[PDB]
């Protein structure tokens, strides 16, 4: 029998990352040729990240430690296309010096007040490793790659004697046909949520914080009369970043009515509760919640295994 899996959830919730992970686990994974191909992509993402932090330093008015580093920035924008083919030791030197600066790190520590991708620090901390001329990207490096998507992402595989077709939709209604067929005859829906976005500052183009957006979307999905026969699976992803953040920034930011303590456990419980509470068919429809970290291949392997077993058990009735 065939299984149609549909990944939904806001941007930056780990869907593409989940897909890549699937390619690693149940398929052969990424070969050395492909790994070689993604090099330029890695360099690019690294650069775009550090640049983004730099431009972000402006709007917040954040002064450097030692002023000299300023010159590097000027040089940076010129060398920004120098990696479009291999990183110059001069360029890698620039990035190193910049990432070493304390003010830049203060901005990075204040990354909630703007928009910084979550694959930044990964690439920036492992700079020395990738700035070598003979560098070949690891599978984990490829996992953290950020690729602009234009169409519908699809991947298929065989596992536990079952045929899985998994769809990531994205946003392009440039394709208005097949796009919709991705919502047709779905076995189960996997809604992804970035927990770490609880403390994000309200952008000027938002009417409600990102978490409440994810909530509204979920509300619209669960209680949609078209998925009555569809199993709903919730991935509260980015649990690691959540755990790190929750020590310092309170949940009251996201939910002002929250009375509990700021322990990871109790907080996460409150979030999960908040999402699950939106199901206006609690009797008929149950929701399958998991706390994931899509960058941890092992974790994803286990979670997906368990989900699969759930589906099989549902198939025997």
């Amino acid at each position: 029998k065939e299984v149609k899996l549909l990944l939904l959830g806001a941007g930056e919730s780990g869907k593409s990352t989940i897909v890549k992970q699937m390619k690693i686990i149940h398929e052969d994974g990424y070969s050395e040729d492909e790994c070689k191909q993604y090099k330029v992509v890695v360099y690019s993402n690294t650069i775009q990240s550090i640049i983004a932090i730099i431009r972000a330093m402006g709007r917040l008015k954040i002064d450097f430690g030692e002023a000299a580093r300023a010159d590097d920035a000027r040089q940076l924008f010129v060398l920004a296309g120098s990696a479009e083919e291999v990183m110059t030791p001069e360029l890698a030197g620039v990035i190193k010096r910049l990432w070493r600066d304390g003010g830049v790190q203060a901005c990075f520590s204040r990354s909630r007040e703007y928009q910084l991708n979550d694959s930044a620090s990964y690439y920036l901390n492992d700079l020395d490793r990738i700035s070598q001329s003979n560098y070949i990207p690891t599978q984990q490096d490829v996992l953290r790659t950020r690729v602009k998507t234009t169409g519908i992402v699809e991947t298929h595989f065989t596992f536990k004697d079952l045929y899985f077709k998994m769809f990531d939709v994205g946003g392009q209604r440039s394709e208005r046909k097949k796009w919709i067929h991705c919502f047709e005859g779905v076995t189960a829906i996997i809604f992804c949520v970035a927990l770490s976005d609880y403390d994000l500052v309200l952008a000027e183009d938002e009417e409600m914080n990102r978490m409440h957006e994810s909530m509204k979307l979920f509300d619209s999905i669960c209680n949609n009369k078209w998925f009555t026969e569809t199993s709903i699976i919730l991935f509260l992803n980015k649990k690691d970043l959540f755990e790190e953040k929750i020590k310092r920034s309170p949940l009251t930011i996201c939910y002002p009515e929250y009375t509990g303590s700021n322990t990871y456990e109790e907080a996460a419980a409150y979030i999960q509760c908040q999402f699950e509470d939106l199901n206006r068919r609690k009797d008929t429809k149950e929701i399958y919640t998991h706390f994931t970290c899509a960058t941890d291949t092992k974790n994803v392997q286990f979670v997906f295994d368990a989900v699969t077993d759930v589906i099989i058990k549902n198939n025997l009735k």
Binding site: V40, V41, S44, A52, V147, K148, G171, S214, I221
Partner: peptide
């Protein structure tokens, strides 16, 4: 109504800090 919600909340994917596929 569902679809306009879908798009009203999705596409904010940070297309900068993101490069073109190989």
């Amino acid at each position: 109504d569902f679809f306009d919600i879908l798009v009203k909340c999705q596409g904010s994917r940070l297309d900068d800090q993101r490069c073109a596929p190989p």
